[PDB]
Ligand binder design. Structure first.
Ligand code: PBU
Ligand code: PBU
Lengths: 241, 1042
């Protein structure tokens, strides 16, 4: 009963345990120098418990477990070990189970590659968007200045034109080189904006297919540590990875 | 040793003798002739045709000769009476006071300038456009910050600044000289046995150079002095060699050495390193390099006045921005209500996903309650909940550092975006009212549901998922208890705990603790990642009063408090109060993310305050800088300790600036780290002017590689090169890339560029191999030329951390007696994937070694040609000598390598130097972060010694597995793996402080957990040795025992 025990994953030190505890929820239990002691219970954030205390009417390693699978409120203020029988598509080859491993493992690799492609595009696009936000305003500022200018142009112009004939002309000229230029810039700030909100758009299409392709990348991931586990329960595992 | 390109002289016996922000918006690097609209104060544009590189002096000058030809001239006055202004990149109207800047260097947005007379009379206080250029965001952008925390940090911190500026000008000029040129000095004065041993019982020959008149004339004086005699003594016996004439009585000789003597101070020939205080001579890193490398130190006799000439004043200014008692938190009589209202902008395929629900928790590093969800109601299309959440934890029991942590999830369970909110604001008020938080996108690593490791604050983005919350209202604002009103709680608890008689878990006059419960000095000794059991936590908590004796147990004890129990936490405060100060290598875990309490971290600082030297501090600066993310508010005790250090020692100042500025682009810290830089730059004095100039080049350098990488690759090296060169001929560049300090080590001046020695390397990422002339008068005696590489496109942060983890391992071994010689070449991340990599001169890739020699008909590598090539470069005992180094370094870059589990060491990322020293370059990703996909257990051997390397280790003959030289080696490796094993805590604590960085191979303590397998910490050394040997024995296909 102790070897089989279902949640007695054996020798798996602190790190094999924790990286078999990452992502299960509450209720989750599983049992593990002798300057320290014997076996450890590791529930769930991770809770290590070394009977635990004086009321050891033992009587077993297992007689302890089913009173606290029945609990631990009453000493201090859910097997999750299910002998890789569940799925692993009962393919009893030791090798069909193994080659399968690779088949999900390239698939996981395949997705992490589309994923990270996407993680970086988001981070890029974010930064192109902000750079487009303080351009839009570097335009608005530019025009403010030109407006301010072409007005001071009329403040001084209609003040020197109490006149005699030449000047008259070639003042209106540069004043009108100025107000076309004001239009020209404005031509640019709507244009940038139309690309801004064009990008602001496709930005979503990234957060969309990220949070669309995260579901997979944990399930596809999960079943791998499912399959991979039915190998090390019975049986070099390098080749399929 | 960065001094001599790590070049051992083997015969020498001492005995037997904003981005995309090119020059213009979009553009990049601006076209060579460019039209500039010049808006006048008479309202007239006039378009000047201007060269790319012209100074606003020439432009102002040309414009007022050209307005002369447009209407309304008499309405303007002399140039003298105006300044140029325009909209810059960062969209802020910059007045252009320095009229010698170039049209290409201003960062203009649109090519137009405007003429104004400069109101704002304090033309002085607007020199701080500097401060803005130095940080790459403009100071005025802070006066635009509404939030009251930031605007408070800005004023409060000024304390520290005046403290520093004061504590400097203390014994002017000497104290300011001590500021700028702080003695570069090893940590032990006690030399190690193997170094002492190259010294014929402790005596160095040193060569003092002197300057009288022209003086392009020099004079050597080769002293041979006791290894540990302070610079003064050296200057003494120096001037003694100089004078002693046949016309000088002995008495009057001694007199002259008295007068003259201290008008001089010692400078290192060939760089800006000075020896300005008492140290045993062998303590300055230079001498102790020179010894290590078989070198004769060259010092230069410096007129002390002529130094106090070269610095002048830093001249500080205090800057331009120069409900009653509330209600005790402990009075609030209820659980915590938190109401998640709606969420705005989640983007998902309505078909592709089932539903979504907001998942929350309260945390303190690791939570204090039964985490909770909230019904999966309105999925996806416009998602509201109106739920209040009932967290079971009474409100008086919230920790100072307690924090709400939420995330929107998909069901099938899957997290979309996460957010963490600080349940207390800085002034101590318990959060209430509306909060619109702004979530972060879930990263690479974390495939978990929440994220307490993450940063606390709203993500700044109009376009991220905004989730809107409501914290309970208590008809008065609520503040966290006074530091006294808690010490009154403790005393109660303690007088209460002393009167029970049943026992339970915390089953604690004179306590029964006798001997047997010396399992306490046991827990103590285990490293951090290694978890604490339930019992152990209760056990510790129950003998808290004892622990003070074994004071370095604290990092555990703390984890043993139930942080949702004021009684416990209120007592744990009173211990921290009079807890023994502890050694830095362990007070530093106290700043990692697992200890977020203020009192705790305050102590961790008091510890540093006491022990850490100015040198240990520059050794762990990254860890220190980086860890700041885990401080809860802006104005915190760590920030303040660091800043004061930055402004006291300008060589810490240097790397504090850069480390901060490196992350400047990183949204999680941009805020924190800008304000801190505004602080540094305002008070560091003259240095700010030096930094502007480094900053000025690194930009030109960014914008050059940036054109090479985009539209410019596809043309053969030859073409690309004859562009890179064309471009650095530009006047604006010659100017900007030529007279500055190396950001890699600021003592190294960079003079004229030398182009024929510049070039683009082979790598896809187009690195720039640049070469500068050393404009030191003793250029010669150190390195006449001086080269560094500039790489744009690699997160350097990793290469950098390994290189820092190699440097530490080295000191560890050596600074203990055990001589392995690693060469952690210098590396600096100066931006987002933009860094500087130091060049080891006289190195070669194994590949070339094998390619430089070995037969005609290209038909397959001769496995002996490494040996051969070495055996060419080193005949003599100069042979026996070079092999020892090759053996001693090979053993080092092997252990370190196996430990940190870095990338595969295939045949052209291992390098060999002429003196026989081998080292690595290009560490791929450490901590085997390619077990991301698979890597279950593995514990791979990255460096695996082929026949090639073995042949060289056993001087020659066949059957190398079995010689003595090999045993010698093996016995080196054992000694070197076991030595690191003794310090593992520091090494975990080191990687721990790094989690804060955005490095994707460092996401969470499980990332670090590798090290604990490599180092076999779960076992006794006895066992580890064997595990290690076995591991070697196996990638080495047998023969690694006896
Ligand atoms: C016949 C001319 C030959 C020549 O030498 O031409 C050289 C330079 C112009 O530089 P460029 O590198 O060709 O221009 C860049 C690229 O073409 C890129 O494809 C483009 O992307 P997108 O516009 O498709 O986005 C960039 O747009 P921005 O985003 O930077 O505006 C663009 O600026 O002119 C001169 O300096 C001399 C002429 C006075
Ligand atoms: C935006 C597109 C990204 C891209 O594909 O860009 C291609 C390159 C730039 O290199 P990279 O991909 O950023 O870098 C990759 C890593 O170094 C990795 O370690 C390695 O795997 P391994 O085999 O050493 O384990 C990869 O090998 P392949 O991926 O070449 O097989 C290597 O490329 O640009 C070019 O010059 C393209 C020329 C066609």
């Amino acid at each position: 009963s102790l070897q089989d025990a279902e949640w007695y994953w054996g020798d798996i030190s602190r790190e094999e345990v924790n990286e078999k505890l990452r992502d299960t929820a509450d209720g989750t239990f599983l049992v593990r120098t002798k300057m320290h002691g014997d076996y450890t219970l590791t529930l769930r954030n991770n809770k290590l418990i070394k009977g635990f205390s004086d009321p050891l009417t033992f009587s077993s390693v297992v007689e302890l477990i089913n009173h606290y699978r029945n609990s631990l409120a009453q000493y201090n203020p859910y097997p999750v070990s299910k002998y890789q029988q569940d799925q692993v598509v009962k393919e009893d080859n030791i090798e069909a189970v193994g080659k399968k491993l690779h088949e999900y493992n390239t698939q996981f690799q395949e997705k992490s590659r589309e994923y990270d492609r996407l993680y970086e595009e988001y981070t890029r696009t974010s930064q192109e968007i902000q750079m487009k936000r303080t351009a839009i305003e570097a335009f608005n500022e530019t025009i403010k200045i030109f407006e301010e200018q072409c007005q001071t142009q009329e403040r001084y112009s209609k003040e020197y034109i109490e006149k005699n004939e030449k000047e008259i002309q070639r003042i209106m000229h540069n004043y009108d080189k100025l107000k076309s230029r004001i239009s020209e810039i404005i031509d640019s700030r709507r244009r940038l904006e139309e690309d801004l909100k064009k990008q602001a758009a496709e930005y979503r299409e990234i957060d969309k297919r990220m949070n669309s392709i995260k579901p997979d990348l944990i399930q596809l991931r999960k079943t791998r540590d499912q399959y991979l586990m039915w190998l090390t329960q019975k049986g070099k595992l390098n080749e399929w990875l | 040793m960065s001094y001599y390109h790590h070049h051992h002289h083997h015969d020498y016996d001492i005995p037997t003798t904003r981005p995309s922000s090119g020059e213009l918006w979009g553009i990049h690097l601006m076209p060579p002739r460019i039209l500039v609209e010049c808006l006048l104060p008479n309202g007239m544009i006039v378009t000047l045709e201007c060269l790319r590189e012209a100074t606003l002096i020439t432009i102002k000058h040309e414009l007022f000769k050209e307005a002369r030809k447009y209407p309304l001239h008499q309405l303007l006055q002399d140039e003298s009476s105006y300044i140029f202004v325009s909209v810059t990149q960062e969209a802020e109207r910059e007045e252009f006071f320095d009229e010698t800047r170039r049209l290409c260097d201003l960062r203009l947005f649109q090519p137009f300038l405007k003429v104004i007379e400069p109101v704002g009379n304090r033309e002085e206080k607007i020199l701080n456009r500097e401060i803005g250029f130095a940080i790459g965001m403009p100071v005025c952008e802070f006066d635009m910050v509404k939030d009251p925390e930031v605007q408070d940090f800005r004023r409060n911190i000024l304390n520290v600044c005046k403290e520093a500026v004061d504590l400097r000008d203390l014994n002017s000029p000497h104290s300011r000289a001590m500021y700028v040129y702080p003695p570069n000095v090893e940590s032990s004065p006690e030399l190690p046995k193997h170094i002492y041993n190259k010294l014929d019982k402790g005596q160095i020959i040193v060569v003092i150079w002197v300057i009288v008149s022209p003086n392009n004339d020099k004079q050597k004086y080769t002293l041979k002095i006791n290894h540990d005699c302070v610079p003064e003594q050296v200057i003494a016996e120096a001037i003694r060699k100089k004078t002693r004439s046949m016309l000088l009585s002995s008495e009057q000789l001694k007199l002259c050495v008295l007068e003259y003597q201290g008008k001089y101070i010692l400078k290192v020939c060939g760089c800006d390193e000075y020896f300005l205080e008492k140290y045993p001579l062998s303590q300055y890193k230079y001498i102790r390099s020179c010894i290590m490398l078989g070198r004769m130190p060259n010092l230069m006799l410096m007129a002390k006045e002529s130094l106090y000439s070269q610095l002048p004043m830093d001249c500080f200014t205090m800057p331009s921005y120069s409900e009653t008692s509330t209600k005790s938190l402990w009075v609030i009589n209820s659980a915590l209500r938190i109401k998640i209202l709606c969420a705005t902008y989640v983007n998902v395929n309505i078909r592709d996903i089932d539903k979504i629900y907001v998942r929350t928790g309260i945390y303190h590093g690791g939570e204090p309650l039964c985490d909770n969800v909230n019904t999966q109601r309105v999925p996806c299309s416009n998602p509201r909940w109106n739920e209040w959440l009932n967290y079971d934890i009474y409100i008086p029991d919230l920790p100072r550092a307690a924090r709400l942590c939420l995330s929107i999830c998909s069901v099938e369970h899957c997290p979309l975006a996460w957010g963490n909110i600080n349940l207390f604001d800085y002034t101590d008020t318990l959060v209430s009212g509306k909060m619109a938080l702004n979530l972060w996108p879930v990263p690479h690593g974390l495939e978990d549901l929440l994220n307490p490791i993450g940063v606390t604050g709203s993500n700044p983005n109009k376009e991220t998922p905004c989730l809107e919350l409501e914290f309970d209202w208590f008809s008065s604002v609520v503040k966290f208890p006074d530091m006294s009103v808690i010490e009154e709680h403790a005393n109660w608890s303690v007088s209460r705990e002393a009167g029970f008689s049943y026992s339970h878990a915390g089953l604690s006059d004179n306590e029964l603790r006798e001997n047997d419960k010396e399992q306490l000095k046991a827990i103590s000794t285990r490293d951090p990642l290694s978890e604490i059991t339930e019992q152990e936590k209760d056990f510790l908590w129950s003998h808290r009063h004892y622990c003070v004796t074994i004071p370095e147990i604290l990092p555990k004890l703390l984890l043993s408090v139930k942080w949702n129990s004021r009684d416990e936490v209120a007592q744990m405060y009173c211990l921290v109060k009079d807890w023994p100060p502890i050694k830095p290598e362990q007070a530093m875990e106290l700043l990692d993310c697992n200890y977020p309490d203020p009192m705790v971290r305050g102590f961790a600082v008091r510890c540093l305050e006491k022990y850490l030297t100015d040198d240990k501090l520059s050794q762990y600066l990254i860890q220190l800088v980086q860890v700041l993310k885990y401080e809860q508010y802006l104005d915190n005790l760590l920030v303040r300790f660091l800043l004061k250090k930055a402004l006291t020692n300008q060589r810490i100042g240097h790397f504090f600036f850069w480390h901060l500025k490196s992350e400047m682009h990183n949204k999680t810290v941009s805020q924190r780290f800008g304000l801190l830089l505004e602080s540094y730059c305002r008070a560091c004095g003259m240095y700010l002017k030096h930094l502007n100039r480094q900053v000025e080049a690194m930009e030109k350098l960014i914008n050059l590689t940036d054109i090479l990488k985009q539209e410019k690759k596809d043309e053969t090296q030859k073409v690309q090169m004859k562009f890179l060169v064309e471009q650095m001929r530009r006047p604006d560049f010659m100017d900007a890339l030529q007279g500055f300090l190396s950001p890699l080590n600021p003592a190294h001046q960079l003079g004229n560029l030398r182009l024929e020695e510049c070039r683009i390397m082979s790598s896809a990422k187009r690195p720039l191999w640049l070469n500068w002339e050393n404009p030191d008068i003793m250029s010669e005696l150190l390195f006449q030329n001086n080269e560094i590489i500039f790489k744009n496109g690699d997160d350097l942060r990793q290469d950098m951390l390994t290189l820092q983890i190699i440097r530490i391992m080295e000191n560890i071994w050596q600074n203990q007696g055990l001589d392995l010689r690693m060469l952690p070449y210098g590396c600096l991340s100066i931006g987002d994937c933009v860094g500087l990599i130091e060049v080891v001169r006289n190195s070669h890739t194994i590949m070339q070694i094998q390619c430089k020699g070995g037969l005609k008909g290209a038909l397959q590598f001769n496995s002996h040609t490494l040996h051969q090539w070495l055996k060419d470069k080193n005949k003599g005992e100069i042979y026996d000598a070079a092999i020892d180094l090759f053996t001693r370094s090979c053993a080092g870059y092997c252990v370190a390598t196996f430990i940190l589990g870095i990338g595969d060491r295939h045949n052209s990322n291992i390098m060999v130097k002429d003196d026989g020293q081998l080292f690595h370059i290009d560490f791929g990703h450490f901590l085997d972060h390619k077990k991301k996909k698979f890597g279950y257990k593995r514990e791979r051997v990255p460096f695996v010694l082929t026949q090639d390397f073995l042949i060289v280790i056993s001087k020659g003959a066949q059957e190398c597995t079995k010689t003595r030289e090999f045993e010698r080696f093996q016995e080196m490796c054992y000694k070197a793996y076991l030595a690191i094993r003794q310090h593992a805590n520091l090494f975990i604590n080191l990687f721990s402080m790094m989690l804060g960085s955005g490095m994707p191979e460092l996401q969470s303590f499980d990332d670090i957990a590798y090290i604990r397998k490599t180092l076999a910490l779960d076992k006794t050394e006895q066992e580890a040795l064997e595990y290690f040997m076995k591991q070697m024995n196996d990638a080495h296909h047998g023969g690694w025992t006896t």
